[PDB]
Scaffold this active site. Structure first.
Site, short mmCIF file in Angstrom:
data_model
loop_
_atom_site.label_atom_id
_atom_site.label_comp_id
_atom_site.label_asym_id
_atom_site.label_seq_id
_atom_site.Cartn_x
_atom_site.Cartn_y
_atom_site.Cartn_z
N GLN A 168 0.82 -1.21 0.00
CA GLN A 168 0.00 0.00 0.00
C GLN A 168 0.85 1.26 0.00
O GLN A 168 0.69 2.13 -0.86
CB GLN A 168 -0.95 0.00 1.19
CG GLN A 168 -1.98 1.11 1.13
CD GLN A 168 -3.26 0.75 1.83
OE1 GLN A 168 -3.29 -0.16 2.66
NE2 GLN A 168 -4.33 1.47 1.52
N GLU A 176 -4.45 -7.00 -1.99
CA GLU A 176 -5.84 -6.54 -2.06
C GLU A 176 -6.08 -5.74 -3.34
O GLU A 176 -5.20 -5.02 -3.80
CB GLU A 176 -6.20 -5.70 -0.84
CG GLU A 176 -5.44 -4.40 -0.69
CD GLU A 176 -5.70 -3.73 0.65
OE1 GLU A 176 -6.47 -4.29 1.46
OE2 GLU A 176 -5.13 -2.64 0.89
N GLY A 212 2.09 -7.04 6.59
CA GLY A 212 2.28 -8.46 6.32
C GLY A 212 2.71 -8.76 4.89
O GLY A 212 3.69 -9.47 4.66
N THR A 213 1.98 -8.22 3.91
CA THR A 213 2.32 -8.48 2.52
C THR A 213 3.60 -7.76 2.09
O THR A 213 4.42 -8.35 1.39
CB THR A 213 1.14 -8.11 1.60
OG1 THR A 213 1.40 -8.60 0.28
CG2 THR A 213 0.89 -6.62 1.54
N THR A 223 0.86 2.27 14.35
CA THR A 223 -0.40 2.04 13.66
C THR A 223 -0.97 0.65 13.90
O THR A 223 -2.19 0.50 13.91
CB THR A 223 -0.20 2.27 12.15
OG1 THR A 223 0.16 3.64 11.92
CG2 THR A 223 -1.46 1.97 11.36
N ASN A 233 7.64 8.07 9.59
CA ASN A 233 6.58 9.05 9.38
C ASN A 233 6.59 10.16 10.42
O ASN A 233 6.24 11.30 10.11
CB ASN A 233 5.23 8.34 9.41
CG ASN A 233 5.01 7.45 8.21
OD1 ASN A 233 4.97 7.92 7.07
ND2 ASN A 233 4.87 6.16 8.45
N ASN A 268 4.36 11.42 0.78
CA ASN A 268 4.71 10.64 -0.40
C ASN A 268 5.33 11.51 -1.49
O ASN A 268 6.27 11.08 -2.17
CB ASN A 268 3.46 9.95 -0.93
CG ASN A 268 2.88 8.95 0.05
OD1 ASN A 268 3.58 8.11 0.59
ND2 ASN A 268 1.58 9.05 0.27
N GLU A 323 28.51 3.55 -7.54
CA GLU A 323 29.47 4.16 -6.63
C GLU A 323 28.86 4.37 -5.25
O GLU A 323 29.59 4.30 -4.25
CB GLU A 323 30.13 5.40 -7.23
CG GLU A 323 29.36 6.64 -7.51
CD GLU A 323 30.26 7.65 -8.21
OE1 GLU A 323 31.43 7.31 -8.46
OE2 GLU A 323 29.84 8.78 -8.49
#
Ligand SMILES: Nc1nc2c(ncn2[C@@H]2O[C@H](COP(=O)(O)OP(=O)(O)OP(=O)(O)O)[C@@H](O)[C@H]2O)c(=O)[nH]1
Ligand SMILES: Nc1nc2c(ncn2[C@@H]2O[C@H](COP(=O)(O)OP(=O)(O)O)[C@@H](O)[C@H]2O)c(=O)[nH]1
Ligand SMILES: Nc1nc2c(ncn2[C@@H]2O[C@H](COP(=O)(O)OP(=O)(O)O)[C@@H](O)[C@H]2O)c(=O)[nH]1
Ligand SMILES: [Mg+2]
EC number: 3.6.5.-
Lengths: 42, 430, 48, 34, 154, 442, 430
Positions: F10, F70, F143-144, F178, F205, F227, F253
């Site tokens: 995500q 997902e 997890g993913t 989180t 974050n 982002n 390098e």
């Protein structure tokens, strides 16, 4: 927008006012009691 | 990612009618079944709860079961009743008599095959099946007996999927049924083995919600079932709408359940506030979090101040910043640190979803796993012990056929559950 | 004619559902109370 | 003891390409060198 | 108001939205100011010149203000209407006039339909401004198989 | 010349959306993949080649894959504004998420999808003639991202071999959090990442939130701002491939210069002219001020304080109107300072780069427009404190087997927890030994 | 490729009248015999069931036989009765008396030569003859005796053709005739030697079809005979219209019968659904396949869950993909693999035909070869043994002339048929 919504809601309340009073007259409530009742409904 | 719903008994069918009204409203489906929505976002996940009929119509993926058709005829007579598929209504011809053993053993085995055939037919049509959702009361007759029977059969047939239950539990002050302790104890015994997650609500707490927070002068069961339908449709919202931090029923379970027996949760819903007051206070994350944690707004009689939080989850709906959510959950955890279990460094999970329910700018639903639930089980066990030593009403159940050892096993297992909660409450690192 | 029958059936069903939903609010409950009172007083008058 | 299960609906496409609903569910087998 | 003479100033299929907003939820003071402002821009010169002031900084401020306002609230304006509104903003508009113009058209434009966060002003399609890109610093891979290619030109 | 981007989960897909928005706007490719045709012909250009390939009708398509378990986020990409930019095969989606289980991503579910991903990456690598690395964006907390990221990097490392792999990685912040199970996933991820990555850049974050509150004037930031900042950083590091300059810098390098020992590959990232538009027009921004800025902890994009450690190597990337002599005067002044310390075994502590292309301005963006910028990457022993605190949180949970039944049920032996935690313990001991000043004869 | 039909006894004549109504309607033949159809596809195979009489007219290739003309006068008085050739009605002057021996030996041998003469006259006119088709009941008197007599004579005279029968068989709960076990046993004994293919239907299963699936309030024999005429006309559909995968009676026989005694099959027809429910579920190939295997939709009292499928066949009518058929047949075979005989690698044959029955977009007929048919034979053999040990009604048959050894032979043959089914059910590869 919120003010517009509440104005439309009040208009709907007036519509169901008229409809319910007409239905009550249709059932056969006696005239004097119906008049006093619709007076206290305003 | 689609859920199949089962509604059982009077309480379950009544709550279900309001739930399917709320869901049909959320996806903009007319009571004739025609799609009339106003954004593609409504249509693009309609499959999650609805099956598609050919021209206009959509049909809701639900099975209705009851022992006397009075309730079923009432829901069919309701404003949305036609939407339900006729072949999906299953009913018998004589009541549960408020007796768990008759409802479980005599009419249960008679009807149960016809409910499983419909549930399997509905489940096997899905391309990928998510958990089941069940609404019932634990104090009743058909709710307890047929709910736990069906739960056991679905757990045998689909053990790798998720099993989810919503359950209504007896108030501490006034009973609605005399034999409530037996039915509740036997049903919780069945659930702790069979169920994956079970939510409990007290009607007394909903009355206190209505009177203190919503100040309704003359509440009706439609209001209580609307509050419940609002939260029920809210927990699944991230499954079925886009968002900045997606979540899932399995994702909730993995973050909420520390040990597999500890799967009973408390409920609350935050942005409850009267239409007159709403003009005086704008929505913001501090206001929502402060109202959200006030025990006045929690839907059970047990109070958090007598226990400690193992874990909690908050699902936010609306357009909002992540910085305020994260920092509020940190400040609340730091300031009230004695009420949070200390061997977990952060007890709260957050999630954020873009689409709020119509006419609210923002909303949050709160899921809490708190040890104060142990007082409810202790109270029920006390009332059971008073009734059981003297066989106070036991002959009805024994005449249906139960051995008393079942009752002593269920009492012992529930008492051990209470002991496990008490040991983990007072555990320490040392 | 089938289209006309289908349209009128939808219209009647939708109107019935709409007028069934409008009594779920809270003003209408008080107004049901007041019409019952009017009814209660009138029937009482006849009883005398 | 296993009850009869009537057949299922065909699986939809998750996206262009992929093995969601094909005859062979497993895509392939990676071969380690050797 | 005057429906017949106002087609080309606005976009083609926005008449019903204007009528709905004006009739239903427009405030009395709001509609007074709305017809006043519509009248005062509707009479502007189609080819009026740029304002003249003794300070170049003030001239740049006014020009950039007009450009920003037009590029902002011109969601459903036409090109002639945009030009006239730009000229009115630079020339005739006062402080309160600009504030009232924004007050009117922010409610006129909006729709209040929920939409996802990425599509909500995070990833919109940018306008045509790719001209003026400094192209003197990109690399150039010369071709050894064609000495007359545009690639080898210094 | 070419680089291939792999986006996982995500955070990695959303950062990819911000990156490709930025890279499009810098080269000038219209969101439908074409170029403007009203300009004069002049002479042809090639800078896109690092990130885009042309078919021949002149439409552009980008060198990226999007991987998620997902559907919702990739389907959001499929229906958004950039629909025509990506090849539809590149947008790969599974059925169901890995539910914060490393075991679910690695053993059961990612194992089905991974071979399609490897075939697509192979199809990309076959259409290249000077591939010089992979860029990977993922978070190790979920997890993913952990499980499929590890499995995919392992497979890439066997198939492609010596080719370099550079990761941009979002690690769990030290007190903002989180999810509950973040320590387990981060430890198990870090075990796989230790063997199979050449440089790993760490982000938190909480630091980008602090930077956006203090330096920018944003009261209510959201993930799109963070982002876009990450995208700007990646654009600064990859600008050295794409534009003319005094001192160019190839991706190999960095890998040769920043990593002293094969386990010591975790680097800190910072960015200098994070400034708002209203302040930017009141001030000049010369070289010495921004060079002094990149070493202040108020400039960093990761929540660590470098004053609690020693620097091993620094890489300073300057882009825009900068002159080498002025960078040299600035770096020599930095080198003089007493509150900045280098390990005594690293005398030549600096690498410099100087590029002529100034940073791009994004229409919705929050950074000001500036004529010059500097970006810093540095290797420092202070990073050892981040692993020690993650390991402490792991010890807190593992002392009571707090969640282990999920992982054991989805197919993993309990022993794997202890092995990975001991490997990270060995990483702290490595950081203790490598960081000890000099030696003694007795 | 033309079939000759024979209708015998009351049940056969009544079902036949509806069959020839359905077939004449499908090819657009007026009850006067004039062609009034609207596509060349109707004309190009009309020869299969009709012979052409002079100037336009068509006559239906059927022989009508009965022992008392009451039924013949009823069918002749019906709405389509005029189409039948007058010389094709053969009748006697006294009834069969529900006695097999009377129907076979006394009035049978008296009339039978005129039936063979008419059948030969009709057969030798064909350019190439396909199998015969016979409708009769097995429980009756003239149906059983003369049907099996005629079958034996036609198998002697035409041993290289196909012999196909549709047959009505006694319900498990209520008898329509007291002497049903004797007549059924002797007729099934004759058929299993003589017949090539025999179809069996229970009236109780059709009643349960009507009540449960169609929810008819007041069903009548016209509906029962319409269901039968639908399946009967469906089996022959691939003979007489184009398609993507043609099929034939011989092709059905070669794929369905593993061993020559095991040729008794169950029938179903899928898109049965009440007019009220039809609005809730659209027609599709997955829906038909799912409904098609539900035992609720099967036309025999035995349920598939008590047996195993040796083989099955599905004939599809309509415009549809082969892909959907292939995945449905794979998914059903894989998920329920224990109910399919494991030493056959694929048990289902499919076939696809372009032309559906009028007013349905698509239809399928299902043929199944299942071992649960053994329960019916065991029940009939039990009732036969109960009756025979006590000579319950035997003097009627012996007075007509039967030797007692025939009854013991027929009983032995039924016991061997039951044994063969039981051995093949529990066989294994080892
Ligand atoms: N900077 C940034 N961080 C994000 C973003 N989205 C999530 N994160 C962070 O990444 C971690 C969560 O990881 P996820 O990406 O949601 O995990 P996942 O890859 O989706 O794995 P699954 O939940 O199994 O699907 C948390 O620390 C979040 O704060 C984002 O858009 N930008
Ligand atoms: N929330 C809610 N609770 C209900 C409703 N009707 C009954 N109950 C509660 O459910 C319990 C009675 O269970 P009941 O539904 O009668 O069990 P049953 O006889 O098996 O159907 C009591 O605690 C009631 O207060 C309802 O409409 N809403
Ligand atoms: N389905 C169906 N069955 C019938 C019909 N007429 C009779 N039967 C059945 O056939 C059996 C009686 O056989 P019958 O035809 O009278 O024998 P017959 O006296 O030799 O002609 C009983 O089971 C009846 O229920 C009919 O029109 N339709
Ligand atoms: Mg995820």
């Amino acid at each position: 927008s919120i003010m517009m919504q509440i104005r439309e809601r009040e208009a709907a309340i007036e519509a169901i006012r008229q409809r319910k009073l007409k239905e009550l007259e249709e059932l056969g409530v006696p005239e004097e009691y119906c008049q006093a009742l619709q007076k206290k409904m305003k | 990612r689609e859920i199949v719903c089962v509604q059982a008994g009077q309480c379950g069918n009544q709550i279900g009618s309001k739930f399917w009204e709320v869901i049909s409203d959320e996806h903009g489906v007319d009571p004739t079944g025609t799609y009339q929505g106003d954004s593609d976002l409504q249509l693009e996940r309609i499959n999650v709860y609805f099956d598609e009929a050919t021209g206009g119509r959509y049909v809701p993926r639900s099975v209705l079961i009851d022992l006397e058709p009075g309730t079923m005829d009432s829901v069919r007579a309701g404003p949305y009743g036609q939407i339900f598929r006729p072949d999906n209504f299953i009913f018998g011809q004589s009541g549960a008599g408020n007796n768990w053993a008759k409802g479980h053993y005599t009419e249960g085995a008679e009807l149960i095959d016809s409910v499983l055939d419909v549930c399997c037919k509905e489940a096997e049509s899905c391309d990928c099946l998510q958990g089941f959702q069940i609404c019932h009361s634990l104090g009743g007759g058909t709710g307890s007996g047929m709910g736990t029977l069906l739960i056991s059969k679905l757990r045998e047939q689909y053990p790798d999927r998720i099993m989810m239950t919503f359950s209504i539990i007896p108030s501490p002050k006034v009973s609605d049924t005399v034999v409530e302790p037996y039915n509740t104890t036997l049903s919780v015994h069945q659930l702790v083995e069979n169920s994956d997650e079970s939510m409990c609500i007290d009607n007394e707490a909903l009355y206190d919600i209505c009177f203190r927070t919503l100040k309704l002068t003359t509440p009706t069961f439609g209001d209580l079932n609307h509050l419940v339908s609002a939260v029920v449709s809210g927990v699944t919202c991230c499954l079925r709408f886009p968002g900045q931090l997606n979540s899932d029923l399995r994702k909730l379970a993995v973050n909420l359940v520390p040990f597999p027996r500890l799967h009973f949760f408390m409920m609350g819903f935050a942005p409850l506030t009267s239409r007159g007051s709403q003009q005086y206070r704008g929505l913001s994350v501090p206001e929502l979090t402060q109202q959200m944690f006030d025990a006045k707004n929690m839907m059970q009689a047990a109070d958090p101040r007598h226990g400690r939080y193992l874990t909690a989850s908050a699902l936010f709906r609306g357009r909002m910043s992540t910085k305020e959510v994260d920092e509020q959950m940190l400040n609340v955890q730091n300031k009230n640190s004695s009420y949070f279990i200390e061997w977990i460094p952060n007890n709260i999970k957050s999630s954020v979803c873009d689409i709020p329910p119509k006419g609210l700018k923002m909303a949050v639903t709160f899921i809490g796993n708190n040890t104060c639930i142990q007082e409810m089980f202790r109270r029920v066990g006390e009332q059971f012990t008073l009734m059981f030593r003297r066989k106070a009403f036991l002959h009805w159940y024994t005449g249906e056929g139960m051995d008393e050892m079942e009752f002593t096993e269920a009492e012992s297992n529930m008492n051990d559950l209470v002991s496990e909660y008490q040991q983990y409450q007072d555990a320490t690192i040392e | 004619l089938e289209q006309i029958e289908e349209e009128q059936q939808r219209r009647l069903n939708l109107e019935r559902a709409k007028t069934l939903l409008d009594e779920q609010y809270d003003e209408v409950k008080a107004m049901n109370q007041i019409v019952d009172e009017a009814r209660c007083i009138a029937v009482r008058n006849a009883q005398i | 003891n296993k009850d009869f299960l009537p057949p299922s609906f065909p699986k939809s496409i998750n996206g262009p390409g992929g093995y969601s609903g094909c005859f062979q569910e497993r895509p392939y087998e990676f071969i380690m060198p050797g | 108001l005057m429906r017949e003479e106002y087609h080309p100033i606005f976009v083609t299929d926005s008449s019903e939205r204007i009528e709905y907003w004006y009739n239903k939820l427009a405030t009395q003071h709001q509609r007074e100011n709305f017809r006043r402002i519509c009248k005062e821009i509707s009479q502007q010169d189609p080819e009026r010149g740029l304002p003249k002031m003794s300070a170049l900084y003030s001239l740049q401020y006014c020009i950039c203000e007009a450009d920003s306002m037009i590029r902002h609230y011109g969601f459903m304006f036409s090109v002639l209407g945009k030009k006239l509104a730009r000229l009115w903003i630079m020339h005739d508009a006062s402080h309160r006039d600009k504030n009232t113009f924004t007050e009117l058209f922010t409610g006129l434009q909006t729709d209040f339909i929920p939409k996802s966060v990425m599509k909500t002003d995070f990833q919109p399609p940018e306008q045509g401004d790719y001209e003026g890109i400094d192209r003197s610093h990109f690399l150039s891979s010369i071709d050894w198989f064609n000495p007359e290619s545009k690639r080898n030109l210094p | 010349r070419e680089a291939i981007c792999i986006h996982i989960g995500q955070a990695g897909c959303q950062v990819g959306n911000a990156c490709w928005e930025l890279f499009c706007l810098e080269h000038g490719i219209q969101p439908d993949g074409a170029m403007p045709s009203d300009k004069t012909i002049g002479v042809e250009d090639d800078a896109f080649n690092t990130f885009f390939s042309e078919t021949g009708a002149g439409k552009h398509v980008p060198r990226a894959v999007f991987l998620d378990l997902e559907p919702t986020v990739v389907d959001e990409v499929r229906t958004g504004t950039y629909r025509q930019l990506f090849h539809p095969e590149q947008l790969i989606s599974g059925k169901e998420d890995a539910a914060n289980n490393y075991a679910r991503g690695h053993y059961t579910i990612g194992k089905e999808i991974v071979d399609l991903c490897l075939d697509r990456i192979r199809k990309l690598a076959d259409n290249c003639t000077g591939l010089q690395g992979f860029l990977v964006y993922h978070a190790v907390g979920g997890g993913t991202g952990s499980g499929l990221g590890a499995l995919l990097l392992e497979r890439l490392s066997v198939d492609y071999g010596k080719k370099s792999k550079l990761g941009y990685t979002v690690y769990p912040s030290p007190q903002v959090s989180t999810a509950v199970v973040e320590p387990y996933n981060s430890v198990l991820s870090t075990h796989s990442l230790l063997e199979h990555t050449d440089v790993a850049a760490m982000l938190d974050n909480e630091a980008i939130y602090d930077l956006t509150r203090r330096n920018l004037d944003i009261e209510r930031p959201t993930y799109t701002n963070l982002n876009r900042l990450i995208g700007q950083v990646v654009s600064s590091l990859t600008a050295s491939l794409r534009f003319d300059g005094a001192l160019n810098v190839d991706l190999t390098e960095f890998q040769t210069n920043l990593v002293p020992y094969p386990r010591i590959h975790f680097v800190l990232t910072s960015y200098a002219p994070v400034i708002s538009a209203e302040k930017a027009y009141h001030e000049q921004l010369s070289v010495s001020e921004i060079s002094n800025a990149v070493f202040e902890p108020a400039s960093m994009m990761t929540k660590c304080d470098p004053r609690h450690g020693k620097y091993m190597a620094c890489c300073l990337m300057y882009r825009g109107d900068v002159v080498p002599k002025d960078v040299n005067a600035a770096v020599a002044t930095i080198k003089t300072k007493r509150t900045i310390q280098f390990v005594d075994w690293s005398p030549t502590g600096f690498k410099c780069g100087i590029n002529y292309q100034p940073p791009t301005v994004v229409p919705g963006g929050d950074l000001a427009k500036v004529q010059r910028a500097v970006c810093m990457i540095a290797n420092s022993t202070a990073i050892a404190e981040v692993f020690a605190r993650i390991d402490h949180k792991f010890d807190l949970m593992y002392s009571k087997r707090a969640f282990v039944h999920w992982y054991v049920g989805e197919g993993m032996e309990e022993g794997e927890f202890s092995e990975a935690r001991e490997d990270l313990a060995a990483l702290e001991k490595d950081y203790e030994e490598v960081g000890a000043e000099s030696a003694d004869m007795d």
